[PDB]
Amino acid sequence: MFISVLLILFALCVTLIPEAHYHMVRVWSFVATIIPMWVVTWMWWNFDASGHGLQMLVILGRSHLAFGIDGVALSLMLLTTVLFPICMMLLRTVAGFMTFILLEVLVLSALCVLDLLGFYILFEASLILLFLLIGRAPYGSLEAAYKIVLYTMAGSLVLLPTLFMIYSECGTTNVLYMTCAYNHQTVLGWGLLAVLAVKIPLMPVHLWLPEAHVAAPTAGSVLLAGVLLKLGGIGFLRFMLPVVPEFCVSVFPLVSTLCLVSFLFSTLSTLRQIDLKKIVAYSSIAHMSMVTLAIFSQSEFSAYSSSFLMIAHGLISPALFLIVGILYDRAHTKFILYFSGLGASMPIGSTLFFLFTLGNLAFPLFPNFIAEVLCMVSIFAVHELLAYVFCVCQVLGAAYGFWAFNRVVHGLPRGPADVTRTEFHTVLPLLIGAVWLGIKPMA
Amino acid sequence: MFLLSVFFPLLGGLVNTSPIARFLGHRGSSIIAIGCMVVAFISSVVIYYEVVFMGCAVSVDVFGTWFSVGTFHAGWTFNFDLLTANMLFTVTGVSMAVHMYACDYMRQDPHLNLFLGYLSYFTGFMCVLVAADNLLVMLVGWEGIGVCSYLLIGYWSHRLSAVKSAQKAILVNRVSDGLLMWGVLWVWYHLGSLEYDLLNVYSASGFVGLSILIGAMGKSAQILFHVWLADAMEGPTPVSALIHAATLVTAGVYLLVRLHIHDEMFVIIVGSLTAFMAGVFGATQSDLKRVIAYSTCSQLGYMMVSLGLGETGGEASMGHLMTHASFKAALFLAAGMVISGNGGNQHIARYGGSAHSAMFTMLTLMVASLSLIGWPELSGFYSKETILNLAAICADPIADVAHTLLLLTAMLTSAYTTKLFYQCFMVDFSGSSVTPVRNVLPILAMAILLLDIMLKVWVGTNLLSGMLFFLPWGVKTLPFGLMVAGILTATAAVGSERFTLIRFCGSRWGFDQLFARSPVNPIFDLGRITWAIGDRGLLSVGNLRA
Amino acid sequence: NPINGLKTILHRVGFAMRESGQALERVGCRLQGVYSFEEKLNRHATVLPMRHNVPSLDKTSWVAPSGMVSGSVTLGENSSVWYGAIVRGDFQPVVVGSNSNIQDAAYVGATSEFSGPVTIGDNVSVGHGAVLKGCTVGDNVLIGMNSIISEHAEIQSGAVIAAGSYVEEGTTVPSGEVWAGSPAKKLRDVRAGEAEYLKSLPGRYTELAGEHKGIMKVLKMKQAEYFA
Amino acid sequence: TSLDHVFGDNSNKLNYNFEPMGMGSLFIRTMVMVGVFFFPVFIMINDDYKYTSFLDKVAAAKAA
Amino acid sequence: EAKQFTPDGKYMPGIFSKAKPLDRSTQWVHKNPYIEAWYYRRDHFENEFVWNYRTTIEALWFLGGFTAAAYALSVFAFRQADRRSGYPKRQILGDEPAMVLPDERQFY
Ligand SMILES: CCCCCCCCCCCCCCCCCC(=O)O[C@@H](COC(=O)CCCCCCCCCCCCCCC)COP(=O)(O)OCC[N+](C)(C)C
Numbered sequence A: 001m002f003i004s005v006l007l008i009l010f011a012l013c014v015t016l017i018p019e020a021h022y023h024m025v026r027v028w029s030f031v032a033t034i035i036p037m038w039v040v041t042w043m044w045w046n047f048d049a050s051g052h053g054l055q056m057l058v059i060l061g062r063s064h065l066a067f068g069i070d071g072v073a074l075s076l077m078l079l080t081t082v083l084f085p086i087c088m089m090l091l092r093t094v095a096g097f098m099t100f101i102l103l104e105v106l107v108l109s110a111l112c113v114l115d116l117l118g119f120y121i122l123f124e125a126s127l128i129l130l131f132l133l134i135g136r137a138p139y140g141s142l143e144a145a146y147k148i149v150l151y152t153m154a155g156s157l158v159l160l161p162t163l164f165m166i167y168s169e170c171g172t173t174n175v176l177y178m179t180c181a182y183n184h185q186t187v188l189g190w191g192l193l194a195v196l197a198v199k200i201p202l203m204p205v206h207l208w209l210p211e212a213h214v215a216a217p218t219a220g221s222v223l224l225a226g227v228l229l230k231l232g233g234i235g236f237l238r239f240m241l242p243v244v245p246e247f248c249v250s251v252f253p254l255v256s257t258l259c260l261v262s263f264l265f266s267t268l269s270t271l272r273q274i275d276l277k278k279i280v281a282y283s284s285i286a287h288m289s290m291v292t293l294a295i296f297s298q299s300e301f302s303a304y305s306s307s308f309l310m311i312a313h314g315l316i317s318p319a320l321f322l323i324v325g326i327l328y329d330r331a332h333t334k335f336i337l338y339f340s341g342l343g344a345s346m347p348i349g350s351t352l353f354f355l356f357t358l359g360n361l362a363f364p365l366f367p368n369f370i371a372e373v374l375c376m377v378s379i380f381a382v383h384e385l386l387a388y389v390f391c392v393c394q395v396l397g398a399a400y401g402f403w404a405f406n407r408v409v410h411g412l413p414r415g416p417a418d419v420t421r422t423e424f425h426t427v428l429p430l431l432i433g434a435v436w437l438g439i440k441p442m443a
Numbered sequence B: 001m002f003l004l005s006v007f008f009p010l011l012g013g014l015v016n017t018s019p020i021a022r023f024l025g026h027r028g029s030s031i032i033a034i035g036c037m038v039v040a041f042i043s044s045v046v047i048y049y050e051v052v053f054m055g056c057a058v059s060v061d062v063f064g065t066w067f068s069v070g071t072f073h074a075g076w077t078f079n080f081d082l083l084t085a086n087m088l089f090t091v092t093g094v095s096m097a098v099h100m101y102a103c104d105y106m107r108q109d110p111h112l113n114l115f116l117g118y119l120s121y122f123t124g125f126m127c128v129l130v131a132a133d134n135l136l137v138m139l140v141g142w143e144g145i146g147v148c149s150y151l152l153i154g155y156w157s158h159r160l161s162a163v164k165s166a167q168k169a170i171l172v173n174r175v176s177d178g179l180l181m182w183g184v185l186w187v188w189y190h191l192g193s194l195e196y197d198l199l200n201v202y203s204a205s206g207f208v209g210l211s212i213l214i215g216a217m218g219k220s221a222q223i224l225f226h227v228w229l230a231d232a233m234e235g236p237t238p239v240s241a242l243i244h245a246a247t248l249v250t251a252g253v254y255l256l257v258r259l260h261i262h263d264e265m266f267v268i269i270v271g272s273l274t275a276f277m278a279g280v281f282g283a284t285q286s287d288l289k290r291v292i293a294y295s296t297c298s299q300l301g302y303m304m305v306s307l308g309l310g311e312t313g314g315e316a317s318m319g320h321l322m323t324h325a326s327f328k329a330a331l332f333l334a335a336g337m338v339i340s341g342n343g344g345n346q347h348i349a350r351y352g353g354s355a356h357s358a359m360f361t362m363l364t365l366m367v368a369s370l371s372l373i374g375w376p377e378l379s380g381f382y383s384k385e386t387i388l389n390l391a392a393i394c395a396d397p398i399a400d401v402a403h404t405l406l407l408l409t410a411m412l413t414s415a416y417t418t419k420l421f422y423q424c425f426m427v428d429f430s431g432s433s434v435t436p437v438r439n440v441l442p443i444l445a446m447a448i449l450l451l452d453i454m455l456k457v458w459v460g461t462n463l464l465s466g467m468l469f470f471l472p473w474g475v476k477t478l479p480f481g482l483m484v485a486g487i488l489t490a491t492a493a494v495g496s497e498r499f500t501l502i503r504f505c506g507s508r509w510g511f512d513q514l515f516a517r518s519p520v521n522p523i524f525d526l527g528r529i530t531w532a533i534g535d536r537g538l539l540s541v542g543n544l545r546a
Numbered sequence C: 001n002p003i004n005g006l007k008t009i010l011h012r013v014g015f016a017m018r019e020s021g022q023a024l025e026r027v028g029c030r031l032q033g034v035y036s037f038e039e040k041l042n043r044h045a046t047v048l049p050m051r052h053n054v055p056s057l058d059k060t061s062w063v064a065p066s067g068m069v070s071g072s073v074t075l076g077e078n079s080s081v082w083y084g085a086i087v088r089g090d091f092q093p094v095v096v097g098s099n100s101n102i103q104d105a106a107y108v109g110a111t112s113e114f115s116g117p118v119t120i121g122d123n124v125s126v127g128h129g130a131v132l133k134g135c136t137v138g139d140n141v142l143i144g145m146n147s148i149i150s151e152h153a154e155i156q157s158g159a160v161i162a163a164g165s166y167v168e169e170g171t172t173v174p175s176g177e178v179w180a181g182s183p184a185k186k187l188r189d190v191r192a193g194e195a196e197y198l199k200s201l202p203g204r205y206t207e208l209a210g211e212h213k214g215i216m217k218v219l220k221m222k223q224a225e226y227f228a
Numbered sequence D: 001t002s003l004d005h006v007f008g009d010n011s012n013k014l015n016y017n018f019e020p021m022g023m024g025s026l027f028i029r030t031m032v033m034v035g036v037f038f039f040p041v042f043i044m045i046n047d048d049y050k051y052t053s054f055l056d057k058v059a060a061a062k063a064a
Numbered sequence E: 001e002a003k004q005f006t007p008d009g010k011y012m013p014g015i016f017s018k019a020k021p022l023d024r025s026t027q028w029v030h031k032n033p034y035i036e037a038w039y040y041r042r043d044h045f046e047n048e049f050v051w052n053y054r055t056t057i058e059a060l061w062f063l064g065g066f067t068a069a070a071y072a073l074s075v076f077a078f079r080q081a082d083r084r085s086g087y088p089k090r091q092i093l094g095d096e097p098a099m100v101l102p103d104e105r106q107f108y
């Protein structure tokens, strides 16, 4: 807590640096995100895996805002602290540095909060930052920014009275006493489903993602894909399943059909896309549908497998966004028809593209393979057909993945030259994390 | 010596694709690849003699545990038993000669060391596949050979048809990979483990054998999955030899022989229909490599029926796999030498005479062709006659039709293989390029596979060779007469006037054309519906003009 | 550089104390009823430090009162900065040798974002109205009047740049050559009678700077008679 | 156009209107695809029906 | 033939230089007008939606049809799981009061 105050105050000192010292501004904003990565690694060192489920607790009196660490929050916090310095390497202005610093404060505090009102306050305080990040004046899109902000606001406004309903019902929004009291679970369950089915892209409230994740800059796309979608999953695992479990059983056919149609229809839409960033953007919806069904199965080790799929997606899809961002930065287009023969002109970039293509399709020696196997073990244990639907549709994911790769990488060599040292080192931590988590993830 | 058969081709691939190869060049990388295969073959020979003959299986915990959540436990462990030793000997011995051939065949390619590294990776993932003791490390090998097959089929990436052939192989195998994954889920759920030695099934829930059979039909290119196999000729000749002999197509048959959890009706019907279909397909082709590809599909049908017959049939199935790899790789290497001697032409209407090839290439094609058609007291005679005689005494009435289909297939095979020899050498010359290849490395590559053909006659694959299943002389010597009938018909070069049957068979029954619109175009159109009518239409929320 | 960190902390604390003191003195003036602090007189400074970067002036160098030096400026022995001349080293430093003259209303500076430091050698004549941006000038060089020398250009020793010329970015001018033109180009070599006047030029400026420094001292004493 | 006399020119154009398939053809082929690629669902539904009709026979002839 | 670096490093912008500097926009694509038009049209394809016959029919049989198929399959899987676990009929949303949430202290 004292450490967190010191890290925030060190991060906020970027504004006071005079702008004529360019080197100092770059180094200060990069170190301001490097330090929380070290602190979260130390928190992993301090964790007792044979101890209590909630460790390193702190509660700030009668102000809500109570905090604690479990395994899902700790893995997601480690992933966020990895992803934020890479975002710092892709920005050039103090406005970008400050927006991403404020976003990192809000994400890190939202991932480990234990109060529902605290979760509401901390998460969607990032709405105006996302609006300004997506609708930036010369190269953004105001339509996309309006869509993402309005969908998130709609879901949050459905949740807010139900939050206050359980608060008047039992006397607290602390999740440890909300899980032990008697509450009207249908109303609160519908409010929580309303927020987290927009955060996780679940059809029909999913149309904001294709616009926002493409109109964003490369750093914004890395953040939005790798981090902000998983707040819906940790919302399911931390707040909704412990507090309204009767609802979570009774809504299972509806959540199940939403997940199945989201998976199938989003995979079918990904095949007709002609923009590389839109191809990468749609593929995330099917993965999150598998995550949601694995969470809702509650069957074998469902929290473990679903968290592991969230980590595998958060490693693999930001790297695909990084490669598309390199192509866009040095060729000024994201259109497939302008790219051919990238193997001959960018051999290192095409090799990285192929490896992350194989990772996104859940091939072995990548963490997505272990993730999808364990998620389908959790789904299979409820019924065999709910697993069969995901199993037989694997040709549809590989079709779009290999079609996009084969169209842009082979053929007549036209396009930009190979990657620089900076682009390679933006990609590199994700590759090392993927090789480790896909070969020896546990000990 | 045991881990040297698996690690060390992977090491050769890692060396030849990394920036170490920037310091070696083509000349140094060829040396590295050939040596890294010789060591692995020597290790596999030691493993073969220890496990097959002296009967001492070896289990190695290699890299600890892979992942273990709940009761789902996957470990990095190998086990070297009889089937594993058989497969390792076959794979490494074929891949050594294919590497020695490819270091001379692809000499004028600009990226030679990349090609050699891909060949070594493909071999190493095959070794990982057969050396695994549980299902998940097997899936590592399965998808590894799938990926390396994609990289090697579409090697000449500036050609669009090669790229589309590689994508087609990936997609057709991805359907069966999905079914195989669901079958692994069934097996683990209802037996509690993933290791092969704890998977003893007497009576399971039907979906197990069916889904594992579909997953095997994908890799072994059976009926309604054979469509990728013919288009995989876009890759270079060493790729085709290694795909059709030791890697990839033999993996599904190995999996079914290992598990033995099938239901025999599906297996017998699929195998016999595949054998007859690929026999009539290869009888009506003029592309020299496509005839050999269809003969591979036909022999995989024979092995499928055999493993349907029983445990003895499973042993005969493994035996035919082992003897098939040697003469199939020899056939592809000899065909590559004939193609290079004739200026790259692959049409058998533009061959003839004995000037475009070495004496050893013609001898290799002749001996491997005689082993394939079941000429007496050669290598394929023992295994093919064993499968045919086991099918003639099965008490299942379904196996009665299967045996008739196999005998018709045997006559067709002796027809088109004799046609392949006749068009290539016996007729008058009708090409215009005579550049015969007489380099040392491809000739030694062919001589090694001919030595393995002799070895299979001298030392059998299993104990079935020499066992007498008691059949009358009429039933026993009929396949010899069918071989002679194929030879006489093909040398007479006779044809029929029923041109609509000829063009129905030569166009390969229209499977690709019917698949181009029964699932494929509907998938594209349903994607159009889900995007345009759903995302942009029914679910879209507009703006409020003011 | 943590030394610069300590200097930064001390400079900011002293600046805050100075602001507080000047504000309290203005409150005292308002209490007295005297409003001389509101006069809009000229606040030009001949020497202008940039935080802790103070110009380093020799005791025998002279800067005219309408001239100015800012930031990291080094003036050598008997070197002169004349009337209206601006020598700016607040972004990147300026180094001037000995017996070199920066004549009336000339601009020497390194303020562009990618400019290196300015290095002016010994016995250098920088003419009237010449603009020097981030260049290096060797010994015994005349920079002609209203000339432009660009970033990373090298004016080697003994060369003459004619009046009104423009030497491009990163251009090396060799020794003993005369260059002229707006796309500046070699015109001829320096002649011997020309080189005599080139050798005798900077000493005159040294003695002229001495006379002007004495007259400016007279003016300062005249000014000091009023308030002292 | 330097190789048009060697490999052919660009005068002959592709005859295809890039139009969607007919509605009935799409519906029929999709129904066939659902029947072929989702056959475990129909197998298990048939199993449930054959099981519940036997319990109907037991409950009918038992209480008589 | 530009010179953007001094012999000791030190990048130069070349703002006033005659030779064209190599920079970030050197390999930007030359835009084909028809490709830009087609991508713009596909970017705004929601303006082309119309409730004609084919749109209504395909939105009924495929979108609503497969959504109803998936709901029926989900309910089938839920009921079969509850039967194969020893449970009675369980209360889904809109199904009258019944059993939800089995007790861990109970043997089923
Ligand atoms: C719900 C459980 C949490 C599992 C989430 C999945 C994690 C993804 C990766 C799997 C790694 C497994 C690690 C196992 C041993 C590590 C310690 C451990 O035990 O895990 C911790 C938590 O583990 C973690 O935090 C794992 C961190 C994984 C995140 C990795 C991604 C970030 C790295 C990015 C790439 C960096 C590359 C940099 C190099 C250039 C607690 O989990 P449980 O054992 O379930 O807790 C016990 C429960 N109880 C106390 C109640 C008895």
Ligand SMILES: CCCCCCCCCCCCCCCCCCCC(=O)O[C@H](COC(=O)CCCCCCCCCCCCCC)COP(=O)(O)OCCN
Pocket (backbone or CB within 6 Å): A365, A439, A440, B007, B008, B010, B011, B061, B062, B063, B064, B065
């Ligand atoms: C982009 C795709 C590229 C594909 C690459 C090829 C395909 C790879 C597929 C499988 C990858 C698995 C890699 C695992 C890495 C190490 C994991 C184990 C970590 C560890 O500490 O284990 C110990 C390490 O031992 C050891 O490692 C042995 C000790 C050193 C002796 C041998 C040295 C290795 C020589 C290998 C040559 C090249 C082979 C290439 C694969 C073994 O002990 P344990 O704790 O597990 O205990 C149990 C038995 N004691």
